[PDB]
């Protein structure tokens, strides 16, 4: 199956079978507060960024956890954010869409 890259720059990110269903599907349409519109694909696992700063709880769009901005650890390219402190996963990566390119692995 096909593998996910940084658009920006080829860095690996993550994979098509690590794709995430949460509460029902991969794929959450979603705003930030600066109005921001994001296609985020769910992922249980990936590689290749940088996470930034500390976990935060406000505005997070999934219940239960706090999030932190992901990186490319590459260009440093937004490329999502990484969740953790919840349930069933405790963890995963919300990734936006737009941000990769697929292709063959
Ligand atoms: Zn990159």
Known sequence: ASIFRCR??????????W?????????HVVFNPAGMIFRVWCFSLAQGLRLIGAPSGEFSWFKGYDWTIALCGQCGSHLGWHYEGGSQPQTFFGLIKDRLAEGPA
């Open 8 to 17: 920006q720059c080829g860095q690996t990110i993550s994979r098509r079978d």
């Open 19 to 27: 794709l995430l269903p949460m509460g029902g599907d991969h794929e």
